[PDB]
Structure formats: structure tokens, C-alpha cells
Amino acid sequence: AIKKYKPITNGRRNMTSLDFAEITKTTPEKSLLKPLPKKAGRNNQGKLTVRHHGGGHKRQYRVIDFKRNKDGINAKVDSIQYDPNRSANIALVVYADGEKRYIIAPKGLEVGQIVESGAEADIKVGNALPLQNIPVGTVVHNIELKPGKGGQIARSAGASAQVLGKEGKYVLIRLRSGEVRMILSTCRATIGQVGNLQHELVNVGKAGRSRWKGIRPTVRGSVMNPNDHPHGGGEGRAPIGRPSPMSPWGKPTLGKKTRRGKKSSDKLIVRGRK
Amino acid sequence: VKRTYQPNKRKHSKVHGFRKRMSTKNGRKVLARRRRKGRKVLSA
RNA sequence: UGAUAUUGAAAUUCGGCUUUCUAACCCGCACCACUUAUCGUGGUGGGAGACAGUGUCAGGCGGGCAGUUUGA
């Protein structure tokens, strides 16, 4: 399922694309459509704060529900659709009530799924179930952190995580990065692994192809001036010169740790990433 | 060769207009300095 | 990073190191209301909890930025 081009011209030579064999319907849904104007990494003050953003192709936002909260209703998948916002594909499900919404499509799923509560249905792919009713060693994705907020972890393409032993109030989950942490047992989770596994094997090929995705060129700090980057500039090509490489804002960026986000969560993080 | 001044009625009234200077406190001081000196036109 | 105020109640153990509890404080967590919006306020539930956040004082790091010296 990987399309490979022939070296007809330069640039197109060592290119690689996807096959899009899993997509069923090309036209999206009109009800679940929202505008999404570009920001180009500019703040609410109008100043650039994140570099290398700007340009790209026009896009629209497709409303995806991550709560997955229904009282025993059956839904049959209709089609797998393309999403320019994420790396994974999405699926349009239709409940028995007559309601349609978009969910993240797991790997190998076209059969009907049920938004189930505890022991409502079997452990099958695409079923939303709390972490208390999932046996040890079952791989899951799109799990919640705080009850009712929605799924946050393991949403990229080909991402998943399994469930280790329980401790009454919390369960043990080994994440995709190798990190081990405790998660509250009243949070939902979807059984299975998400598809689009061949998304990372793609070769962009030319510079213009990365331009219309929203990426601007990157200039090295070694070819700047001494007032622009700590790596400055000397006569000819020069090495780093400093005892340690530096960020454009004057902070060491090779090895130093920056763990200051949340201090309450160190109680729940058991082992670091691998 | 292209010059540096291109006339425009809307851009001249939306930046140097009377209502533009009466919306900020520092612009309210500009109309006061021109009244003290005695200029003919205040905002242009 | 420590001392102290906001800041409480219990039980181990040589005035303190600990482990629990809930009532302060906190929640870019759901629900209900003003409200034809959830920015905000107030309720009902969960999580967290005397920690975090904040004020005063003290030590360390700090060409990221600033003021200046580099003799006849």
C-alpha cells in the first residue's frame, strides 16, 4: 500500500506517496464542518512566537467526538474518510437513533460497534469502555485522563498502549514512548490500535511538497550574525566554540532536562520513557 | 522606478483622521498642541 | 532550594523525620442556572489537599541583558 514513483525528473526521483486504498468516500459530511483559519504561529498581539509556520493549503475542521458516551446504542460504520487535520483516518458512524458523528478509525474496522458501558458488550475493536472492565494485557488507544473530558493519549497514526495490573483506584498503563504511569479507573478507553501504519514510511521528495503543508525553511544558527544567535559568526566556517550548544534564546539544548510542567503528577509517573 | 507615496482617501482618513485621534489618550494630546499653537487644520 | 505567614485535625516513631483523614486553598474536570453564548459568577458531583499557588527574608546558578576599565 505504498505508491512509488519513477525517476522521470529530478525531485520526483526519490519520492514516495501513499496508496489511499482504505478510503471509501471522498466527499465529506456537510453537517460536521467548521472553518479553521490559519494563524502562522502569531500571537494574539500579532507577533510571531513559533517559527517555521506559514502558508499551506486551505483546510476545514471536522468535528470528532472523543467522549464516546452513549447508553447502549448500536452504530454501523459507513465509510472511512480522509482528514487533513490528523495523521489517522476517521469513520462516520450512524446510531440507531439516526445520529451521525466522526470517530477515529482503528486498524481493520468496518463492522458495527457499540458505545458500551460496563459489561454491555464484548471486547472488540472500536468499543469505548472504562479502564476497570478491561483485562490485563489488552492494548488500547484514545484513553481519557480526567473523567468526561475526552480521549487525549494515543491518538496519532499507529499509536496504542496496553493495560498492566490494577491497584484498586488506579490502573497501570505503558505508553507508546515507554513511560509508565497511573490512570484513574473511571476513564474511558477504546479497544484496539489505530490504523494508517504506513504513514511514517512516506518520503516527501522535493521542497515544494513540504511547503504546502504549512512549513517554512529553517536557517542554521551557525550562518547567522553574532547579534542573532549565540552560535554567532566568525571568519569562514567555525565550530561551536562554546562549551555547549545553545538555543537561539541562550539556553543549553543538548541533554539538559526541562521537566517543570506539572508537579502534582510526579506521584503517578512510575518509570520514565524508554 | 516606483515612488514611496501612493495616495489613498481611505488610508489617509483611517490613520490620521479626527476620530482616530479622539479614540486614544495620546492622540487627544496632539489636537491640544495644535490648538495651543493656532493651526488652521487640526487632523489631516 | 530552605525558614516563616496563609494553615487544620489524628495516629507511628527518636520538638521533628512519616502515614492517613477533611474543612481551608486549587481544578484551560463534567452537570444545572442566569443566558437567544460559557468569558465570568453562583450551585450540585468527582480529583487533589494542608502540598501546590502567593507575600516577606536567606544561599546558589546566571554574557540572556546592562554600566564601565584595558598605563606611559
Added chain:
RNA sequence: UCCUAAGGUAGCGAAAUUCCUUGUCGGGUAAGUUCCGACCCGCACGAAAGGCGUAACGAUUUGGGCACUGUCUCAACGAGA
């Protein structure tokens, strides 16, 4: 034998690096301080401030041929401002 924390490996070499130097020997010219091929005696090449190669591509930099001509031997005449 002395010494350090270890003593330059694969490659490449009078190089966009070689001061001594127009190094020495071939090839190209009737005549070549530049150019190409080797030699290694690397003042002071060297493996991601990457080493050695490589089709296609270049208003890029060098060496040599074929056409072609007032560039030049060596200038003369005519038209317009």
C-alpha cells in the same frame, strides 16, 4: 628507550590547503611559472564545522580544439546625431 588520557585507521594528496617551489618524471605547444596523468619528501589532508566517488543540472570557475570573423598585422571609405 623516554611519554601521555589515546597517540591519525579506511581513504585522499605540490590540492578553493605545499612556505622551500616554476618540486621531479610523463602528456599536450615550433616555444607552457598556468592545465591534465602519476610520484609522496602531507611546513600545516582526514572521516556528519563529515572522508572518498558519482549520471542529470549551471547567465558558476579553469585548460585545449573546430568553424568564424576589423580583435589584430594596418587601417581605408560611406550614412545619421
Added chain:
RNA sequence: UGAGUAGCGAAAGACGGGUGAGAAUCCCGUCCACCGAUUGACUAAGGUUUCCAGAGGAAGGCUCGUCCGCUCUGGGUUAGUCGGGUCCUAAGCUGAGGCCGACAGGCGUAGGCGAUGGAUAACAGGUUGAUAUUCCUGUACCACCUAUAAUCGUAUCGAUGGGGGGACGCAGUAGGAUAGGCGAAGCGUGCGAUUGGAUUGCACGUCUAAGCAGUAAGGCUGUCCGGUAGCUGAGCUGUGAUGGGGAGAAGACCUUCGAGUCGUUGAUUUCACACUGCCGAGAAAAGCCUCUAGAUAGAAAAUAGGUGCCCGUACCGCAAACCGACACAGGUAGUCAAGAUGAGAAUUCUAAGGUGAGCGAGCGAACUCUCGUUAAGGAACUCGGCAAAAUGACCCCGUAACUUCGGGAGAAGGGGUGCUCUUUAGGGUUAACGCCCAGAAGAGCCGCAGUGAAUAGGCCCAAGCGACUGUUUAUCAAAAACACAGGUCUCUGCUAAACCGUAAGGUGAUGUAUAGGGGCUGACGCCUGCCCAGU
């Protein structure tokens, strides 16, 4: 003073007749020349009376001036439909109450403002010294008001609420139609020079909206509304609109009047994001339809009249009136786009329509500049083949090392090219006749020269650097410098790291380790060894 010195800002003018004190320069006439994918015709911005008529010649115009975009005195912009508002919303701006902050103030919800977009009823002619979808003629449409009829009455009106629609990317053919174009003979007025012609040579060969039908092709098929297991739209054509308007011209003299409107052919870059393909996956809201909450009482058939506001409208608009101190070889979005010659909006000569460039007359020196040719040699020039010359279009023949198999390649190196006649199956278009685009061969004529003019690669053998397309010091450096696809290291469990303010509030991201920020290296191929004392 320099000095009666430089200059007088790309370009073809000549003569006759007028005006007047005064004319190479103003007016009229004729001939000649220039542009013509534009030096022509419409418009947005911008300028703000430069527009028109009768008078003036002090200053301004690089000369002159009786003339003027200059001076003086009077004049000239007409809208229910064309553009903007009484309609809708993008980015952005602003923001009641709120959150934050030494002050000033900052941020932000509901709600507003805001087109370069979406919606929205009018088209042909006539007319002035200056206005025209605006005035006047001819035929229409639209919102509303009142008065009379078919017919009533569970008929009727529905929201700011629900739902459907509005509704959107790029490339690529094929097909229907139409505008304009060309040819033969509609009708009209000429029919003769300088040698022969009377089968002569010129010029015409139209007519819109609205409403009556039928039409290439395209989509789609069976809260009572929306969801769950022939029904719309559509270029064009025909009839009427039109016993009217326009019209090459003629007979007499806003005077009267009466004149043709056919068929053939080749055809768009205009009329369908329609239709297939592709990945980078392509605003929003209102009008418009429908459903019930709520209002318990009309005409959506028709007749007849009546009503309909505010702003812009002159003139220049690739230019002497706009931005450049100037009447300045510069710069300025969009639309219309003829003939012969051609793939063509290239090239040459012309049409509609414009213009002759605001100092001239002589002479035909040195020198400088833009152009043409040149005997015998052919890079001997020079730091360097710098600058010139040469190569150049179309149909044929033929084509190397090397290679990532795509290429190299238009490799190199060669041949053919006009005119006349004869013979001759073929493309399309019509019942044919005809019209349009073409191909073989053969026999001859002409010149020094046949793509006879303009338009249009020089090539080849090697080496260095960067893989490539791309970007850079506006105004002395375009490169080996930057970027790039790829590789690698390191940080980041989500109120993420990072950044701005280092406050509220944001970007990252309406994302979640196949993700995001930072350092280094730079396609591809083969590889990347030794050292942890020190920092």
C-alpha cells in the same frame, strides 16, 4: 565673472489659400510619412473644474505665437432598475457586564462595525457648444397603497427556533452552440485611361430586453419537515416585440418622400467545476424553500388607477491633468483584441481610429557616439576570443562514451526547399452539385542566390565546486554563499516542552511521542576508526 559659452528632453514634413501691427510655429485644403496585442476604444484608483463658448497676449510655454491644460467674463454633471446605503457576512477592529494591572491602561463574552466575496427589477434608438442604461420617443419589469370582481372561512400568517439548500480546490481532453472572419453575384451608384480589356472595377448584404413555445448536453430515479433499519435545472433556436427603428444610396430641393436584408464554408482564449483523473482535501452568513410553536379570518386568478427617497455622474485616466520639485525616455489593476502571412496575442505591411512630438536654417572639417562594407592573412589582439561575425525555421537520414535506465539528444554529421502544367485512391460538410483543409509521382522554365525580405541553438574533448528547481546584499559583489528532500542527536505524558506579556490572556494545537521545539549535517552510492585526563 566664466559667456553671448553648454543646453533648448527619443521621431517627417512640404506647399497653396486665409487671419492679423507682426506667422517655419494659429486656422482651412491637398499630398506625404508614423503606430495599429496599439501612439485606437471603454473603466478602477488618484487628481479636483484642468470640461464648453465668446474675448485677451503682461507673466508661465526651454524659440515664436494672433494659439493654449495660462488670463478675464458667463455656462455645463438630471436614475425605482447602472455602482454604494435603508440587505448578509472573511480577516481585522471595537466591546455592556466581566478578568488583570503603580497610574495611564491591557485582555476579552454576548452584541456590533467592516468587501476585494454572496444576494438584487431595463433594454434598443434619437438628440446638444459641454450630460446620457439618467433627458425625449417605443415596448417592458419590480416592491408597495387603495378602490371593485372569481372564490370564501381550518381558508390565512408564522418566527430571531428545527432542517434542506446557498456552498466553493487543481489539472486534462472530448462535444453542442454562438459572436466575429472569409469567398459567390442579392442592392446601390460608376463604366474610363497612357498600350490591349467591357466576362468592368468599388461599396452594402441590419434590428436588443421582457414573454410565448421547444432545446445539444448534465444530474437523478421513490413538527406531517430532516435523519435510522418523471423530478428539477440548461446554453441556443423559432414566432411575435417590428405596418416601427437603423441603412450603402438616389429623385426633386427636426422639409416631402420611397430602396435589397439570401444561402455556402470554416470557427473561438466567450457560453457548463459540467464530466473523468489526482492529493496538497478545497470560508461564512443572509435572501430563497419547508416543518411545527405561536397568530383563531384572504385573495398568491384578474380589472382600474396611484406611489417609489439619500450619495456619485463634468473632464484626464500607459498620461502635458495620477505618483516622480518640471508640459520629466521612468512607474500605474482590469476589459474590448480586424485583414493578408503563420502553431500562434511571434514577424513584416495595413484597417477602424489616431498622430506628425513646442527651436529652426546652412555646411557636409578634426574629434566622440549609433550604423554598413572591406583585398591578402585568420586570435599573431588581450589579464581573458571581452565585443562583433557565424549557427537559426519546417519535412527526411543518422547518432558515441557514460548512466541512478529516466537520460545523454535538437548529441555530433548530412540532404531537401521557387514557379508552370499534366496524371491522381484519399480528411470533413451537404441528396447531389459546391466549399474548406491535404498527399503521392512525372514532364519543364528561370536566376550569381529559391524558409531569395523581417522573425528563430554555435559545437566538441577534459577538470574543480555545489546533487537538482529555487533564494540573497532595493542603489559597485548572483557566487563554491543560504534553502532544500534525506540522516542523526537531544528535550516534551498534556494546564506538554518552547516562545510573547515574563500579569490576565494567547501561539504551539481546536494537535497528543508515526506528535511538537531546538543543535548539527546536507539527494544517491560505499563508509564513518582511536581517547572520558580536562570542560
Added chain:
RNA sequence: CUACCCUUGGUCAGGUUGAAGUUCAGGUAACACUGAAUGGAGGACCGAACCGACUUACGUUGAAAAGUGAGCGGAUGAACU
């Protein structure tokens, strides 16, 4: 004016080359090799408008405080407006 970005529009005479795929005859237990027609991909090719500024001449009390001639580069895209 210029640099980057945001929202909404517009512009690109004319030719050439012929990737994927489909179809089809052959070929095979079968997958799929070959030929034929079809297809119309690309920071592809030649070249006007448009946008740039590589070499040279003229100009340098210039027509112009950055220009004009003769050639030249890109020209469906990381394009121009």
C-alpha cells in the same frame, strides 16, 4: 516604500515530450512476462505577455539621486499580482 503573514479576487498567445493505470492479443496450476491501443502525469522541454537583472556599450554639472539600447534567465509553480 520595503520584509514576512492573514482574508478575499484576478492573470499565464502557441507548440513538444508521452509516467502510473486501464483495455486488449499472446503467455502460464496460478501469480503475471510480452505486444498493441488508450491514458494525459511532471518544482518536465521550446517559446510571447508578465516578472527578473547575467554580459557589454552609452549616460555620469545625465532625459532619470539607479536609466536607455543590444543580447540574457524563469515562464503550471517554493509562480506573478
